[PDB]
Coordinates of C-alpha atoms and ligand atoms in Angstrom, one line a residue:
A1 CA -68.0 -73.8 244.8
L2 CA -69.4 -73.3 241.3
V3 CA -68.3 -75.7 238.5
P4 CA -67.1 -73.6 235.6
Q5 CA -68.8 -74.5 232.3
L6 CA -66.1 -73.3 230.0
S7 CA -63.1 -75.7 229.7
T8 CA -59.6 -74.5 229.1
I9 CA -58.4 -78.0 228.8
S10 CA -61.0 -79.0 226.2
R11 CA -60.4 -75.9 224.2
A12 CA -56.6 -76.5 224.0
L13 CA -56.8 -80.2 223.2
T14 CA -59.3 -79.7 220.4
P15 CA -57.6 -80.8 217.2
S16 CA -57.5 -78.4 214.2
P17 CA -60.2 -78.7 211.5
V18 CA -57.4 -79.9 209.2
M19 CA -56.6 -82.6 211.7
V20 CA -60.2 -83.6 212.0
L21 CA -60.5 -84.0 208.2
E22 CA -57.4 -86.4 208.4
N23 CA -59.1 -88.3 211.2
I24 CA -62.4 -88.8 209.3
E25 CA -60.9 -89.5 205.8
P26 CA -62.7 -92.6 204.6
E27 CA -60.7 -95.9 204.2
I28 CA -60.0 -97.1 200.7
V29 CA -62.8 -99.1 199.1
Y30 CA -62.5 -102.3 197.0
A31 CA -64.5 -102.6 193.8
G32 CA -64.8 -106.4 193.8
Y33 CA -63.4 -106.6 190.3
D34 CA -63.5 -110.1 188.8
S35 CA -60.7 -110.4 186.2
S36 CA -62.1 -113.8 185.1
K37 CA -64.9 -111.9 183.3
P38 CA -64.1 -110.2 180.0
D39 CA -63.1 -106.5 180.1
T40 CA -66.0 -105.3 178.0
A41 CA -67.6 -101.8 178.4
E42 CA -70.7 -103.4 180.0
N43 CA -68.6 -105.2 182.7
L44 CA -66.1 -102.4 183.3
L45 CA -68.8 -99.7 183.7
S46 CA -71.1 -101.9 185.9
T47 CA -68.1 -102.6 188.1
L48 CA -67.2 -98.9 188.3
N49 CA -70.9 -98.2 189.2
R50 CA -70.8 -100.8 192.0
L51 CA -67.6 -99.3 193.3
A52 CA -69.3 -95.9 193.2
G53 CA -72.1 -97.2 195.3
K54 CA -69.7 -98.5 198.0
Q55 CA -67.8 -95.3 197.9
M56 CA -70.8 -93.0 198.3
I57 CA -71.9 -94.9 201.4
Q58 CA -68.6 -94.0 203.0
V59 CA -68.8 -90.4 201.7
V60 CA -72.1 -90.0 203.4
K61 CA -70.6 -91.2 206.7
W62 CA -67.8 -88.7 206.1
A63 CA -70.3 -85.9 205.5
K64 CA -72.1 -86.6 208.9
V65 CA -68.9 -85.9 210.9
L66 CA -67.6 -83.1 208.8
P67 CA -67.1 -80.0 210.9
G68 CA -69.6 -77.3 210.1
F69 CA -71.6 -79.5 207.8
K70 CA -74.1 -80.3 210.6
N71 CA -74.8 -76.5 210.9
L72 CA -76.7 -76.7 207.6
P73 CA -80.3 -77.9 207.3
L74 CA -80.9 -81.6 206.3
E75 CA -82.3 -80.6 202.9
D76 CA -79.1 -78.7 202.1
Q77 CA -77.1 -81.7 203.3
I78 CA -78.6 -84.1 200.8
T79 CA -78.7 -81.7 197.9
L80 CA -75.1 -80.8 198.3
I81 CA -74.1 -84.5 198.4
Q82 CA -76.2 -85.4 195.4
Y83 CA -74.8 -82.4 193.5
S84 CA -71.2 -83.0 194.1
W85 CA -70.9 -86.8 194.2
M86 CA -69.3 -87.0 190.8
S87 CA -66.9 -84.2 191.6
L88 CA -65.9 -85.9 194.9
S89 CA -65.6 -89.3 193.2
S90 CA -63.3 -88.0 190.4
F91 CA -61.2 -85.9 192.7
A92 CA -60.6 -88.7 195.2
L93 CA -59.9 -90.9 192.2
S94 CA -57.0 -88.6 191.1
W95 CA -55.6 -88.4 194.7
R96 CA -55.4 -92.2 194.9
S97 CA -53.8 -92.3 191.4
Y98 CA -51.3 -89.7 192.5
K99 CA -50.4 -91.3 195.8
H100 CA -50.5 -94.9 194.8
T101 CA -49.2 -94.8 191.3
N102 CA -47.4 -91.4 190.9
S103 CA -50.3 -90.6 188.5
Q104 CA -49.1 -93.3 186.1
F105 CA -52.5 -95.1 186.3
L106 CA -56.1 -94.4 187.4
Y107 CA -56.3 -96.2 190.8
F108 CA -60.1 -96.7 191.0
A109 CA -59.5 -99.2 193.9
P110 CA -56.6 -101.6 195.0
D111 CA -58.3 -104.4 193.0
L112 CA -59.1 -102.1 190.0
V113 CA -56.3 -100.1 188.4
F114 CA -56.8 -98.7 184.9
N115 CA -54.0 -98.6 182.4
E116 CA -54.5 -97.2 178.9
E117 CA -56.0 -100.5 177.7
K118 CA -58.9 -100.7 180.3
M119 CA -59.4 -97.0 179.6
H120 CA -60.2 -97.8 175.9
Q121 CA -62.2 -100.8 176.9
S122 CA -64.3 -98.9 179.3
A123 CA -65.7 -96.9 176.3
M124 CA -65.0 -93.6 178.2
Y125 CA -61.4 -93.1 177.2
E126 CA -61.6 -89.4 176.8
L127 CA -63.2 -89.0 180.2
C128 CA -60.5 -91.2 181.8
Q129 CA -57.9 -89.0 180.1
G130 CA -59.7 -86.0 181.6
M131 CA -59.6 -87.4 185.2
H132 CA -56.0 -88.6 184.6
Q133 CA -55.0 -85.0 183.6
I134 CA -56.0 -83.9 187.1
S135 CA -53.7 -86.6 188.6
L136 CA -50.8 -85.2 186.5
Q137 CA -51.6 -81.8 187.9
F138 CA -51.2 -83.2 191.5
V139 CA -47.7 -84.2 190.5
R140 CA -46.6 -80.9 189.0
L141 CA -48.1 -79.1 192.1
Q142 CA -46.9 -81.6 194.7
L143 CA -50.4 -81.4 196.2
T144 CA -50.3 -82.3 199.9
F145 CA -52.8 -84.4 201.8
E146 CA -53.8 -81.4 203.9
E147 CA -54.4 -79.3 200.8
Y148 CA -56.3 -82.2 199.4
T149 CA -58.7 -82.7 202.3
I150 CA -59.6 -79.1 202.3
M151 CA -60.1 -79.0 198.6
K152 CA -62.4 -81.9 198.8
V153 CA -64.7 -80.1 201.3
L154 CA -64.9 -77.2 198.9
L155 CA -65.9 -79.5 196.1
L156 CA -68.8 -80.7 198.3
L157 CA -69.7 -77.0 198.5
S158 CA -69.1 -76.2 194.9
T159 CA -72.6 -76.8 193.4
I160 CA -75.9 -75.4 194.6
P161 CA -79.5 -75.0 193.3
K162 CA -80.4 -71.9 191.2
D163 CA -83.1 -70.8 193.7
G164 CA -80.7 -71.3 196.6
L165 CA -80.4 -73.5 199.7
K166 CA -82.7 -73.4 202.7
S167 CA -79.8 -71.7 204.7
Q168 CA -77.8 -69.9 202.0
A169 CA -76.4 -67.8 204.9
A170 CA -75.3 -70.8 206.9
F171 CA -73.8 -72.3 203.6
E172 CA -71.8 -69.2 202.9
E173 CA -70.3 -69.3 206.3
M174 CA -69.1 -72.9 206.1
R175 CA -67.7 -72.3 202.5
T176 CA -65.9 -69.2 203.7
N177 CA -64.4 -70.9 206.7
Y178 CA -62.9 -73.7 204.5
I179 CA -61.6 -71.3 201.9
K180 CA -59.9 -69.6 204.9
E181 CA -58.5 -73.0 205.9
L182 CA -56.9 -73.4 202.4
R183 CA -55.7 -69.8 202.6
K184 CA -53.8 -70.2 205.8
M185 CA -52.6 -73.7 204.7
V186 CA -51.0 -72.4 201.5
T187 CA -49.2 -69.7 203.5
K188 CA -45.4 -70.0 203.7
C189 CA -43.4 -69.4 206.9
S190 CA -48.5 -68.2 198.8
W191 CA -50.9 -66.3 196.5
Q192 CA -49.6 -68.0 193.4
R193 CA -50.2 -71.5 194.9
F194 CA -53.6 -70.4 196.2
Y195 CA -54.3 -69.3 192.6
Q196 CA -53.2 -72.6 191.1
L197 CA -55.3 -74.5 193.6
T198 CA -58.4 -72.4 193.0
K199 CA -58.2 -72.7 189.3
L200 CA -57.7 -76.5 189.8
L201 CA -61.0 -76.5 191.7
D202 CA -62.7 -74.5 188.9
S203 CA -61.5 -76.9 186.2
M204 CA -63.3 -79.7 188.0
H205 CA -66.7 -78.2 186.9
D206 CA -66.2 -78.7 183.1
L207 CA -64.7 -82.2 183.7
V208 CA -67.6 -83.1 186.0
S209 CA -70.1 -81.8 183.4
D210 CA -68.6 -84.2 180.9
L211 CA -68.6 -87.1 183.3
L212 CA -72.2 -86.4 184.2
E213 CA -73.2 -86.2 180.6
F214 CA -71.9 -89.7 180.0
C215 CA -73.4 -90.8 183.3
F216 CA -76.9 -89.5 182.5
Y217 CA -76.7 -91.1 179.0
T218 CA -75.6 -94.5 180.2
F219 CA -78.2 -94.3 183.0
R220 CA -81.1 -93.6 180.7
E221 CA -80.0 -96.4 178.3
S222 CA -78.8 -98.9 180.9
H223 CA -81.1 -101.6 179.7
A224 CA -79.9 -101.3 176.0
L225 CA -76.3 -100.8 177.0
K226 CA -76.5 -103.5 179.8
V227 CA -74.9 -101.2 182.3
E228 CA -76.1 -102.0 185.9
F229 CA -76.3 -99.3 188.5
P230 CA -76.5 -100.2 192.2
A231 CA -79.4 -98.8 194.4
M232 CA -77.2 -96.0 195.9
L233 CA -76.6 -94.6 192.4
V234 CA -80.1 -95.1 191.1
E235 CA -81.2 -92.9 194.0
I236 CA -78.7 -90.2 193.5
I237 CA -79.0 -90.1 189.7
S238 CA -82.8 -90.2 189.7
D239 CA -82.8 -87.0 191.6
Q240 CA -79.8 -85.3 190.0
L241 CA -80.4 -86.0 186.3
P242 CA -83.8 -84.0 186.0
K243 CA -82.3 -81.2 188.1
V244 CA -79.0 -80.9 186.3
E245 CA -80.7 -81.2 182.9
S246 CA -83.2 -78.5 183.8
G247 CA -80.6 -75.9 184.4
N248 CA -81.3 -76.0 188.1
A249 CA -77.7 -76.7 189.3
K250 CA -75.5 -73.6 189.7
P251 CA -71.7 -74.1 189.8
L252 CA -69.7 -71.8 192.0
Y253 CA -66.4 -70.5 190.6
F254 CA -63.4 -68.7 192.1
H255 CA -62.3 -67.1 188.8
Ligands
STR1 C1 -71.3 -95.7 184.0 C2 -70.9 -94.3 183.7 O1 -71.6 -93.5 183.1 C3 -69.4 -93.8 184.1 C4 -69.1 -92.3 183.6 C5 -68.4 -91.5 184.7 C6 -68.0 -92.7 185.7 C7 -67.6 -92.3 187.2 C8 -66.3 -91.4 187.1 C9 -65.7 -91.1 188.5 C10 -65.6 -92.4 189.5 C11 -64.5 -92.5 190.2 C12 -64.4 -93.6 191.2 O2 -63.4 -93.8 191.9 C13 -65.6 -94.7 191.4 C14 -66.5 -94.7 190.1 C15 -66.8 -93.4 189.5 C16 -68.0 -92.6 190.3 C17 -67.3 -93.7 188.0 C18 -68.5 -94.6 188.0 C19 -69.0 -94.9 186.5 C20 -69.3 -93.6 185.7 C21 -70.6 -92.9 186.3

């Protein structure tokens, strides 16, 4: 006569966290690249920035439905996103390059694929090589989509403020849960692969530092360099630059 609150049906039908990530993976975004304009550094970079703005809008929508992310306080939900935006951007860039081009090119968007030439023309050739190296690693490792999605969540939880987050305890829980996910995922029916993946995540820090250095530089000199940044990026970079440059961003490592 009393309706049970617990639900055996609901509990069994609930998809795995790995299945939820697959369900919420953002759809590919177009850059709106106009090949009728010359491929100068000013145009290529502005285009990339516009693409970045469109991508971050989807990343935010992704962060709202991310399991466990809602357990953290709002302030720690914005800081983590502003701190890891470059890392998520570069890592998703490598995944698309790997899946869509076998890591032969940098697949920024279906309408914008960089070959060596555009890499030189972009005026950030070495950085492009840096991100392309990660794509090559996806091939040697035969990274799987499941491994990818988990790794991306970890990147979102890879950089925190020096003084700490509002809920450092809640943060530690979520990060631990996802590291577990990757742990059980890399398990054959294992430690060497888990090692290769963790070191891959760690290497993202130095790469991201280099990308950010170029980003902060082009941002402060955008007028002189004529590189346009969309609203979404001005917001993110205006908050991140003074924090990163002041030694207030702490990177988390596995090794
Ligand atoms: C203009 C500039 O400084 C460049 C240097 C690093 C570049 C970013 C590198 C990573 C990246 C990957 C993408 O798929 C979208 C654009 C972004 C987010 C790039 C936007 C333009 C940046 C920020």
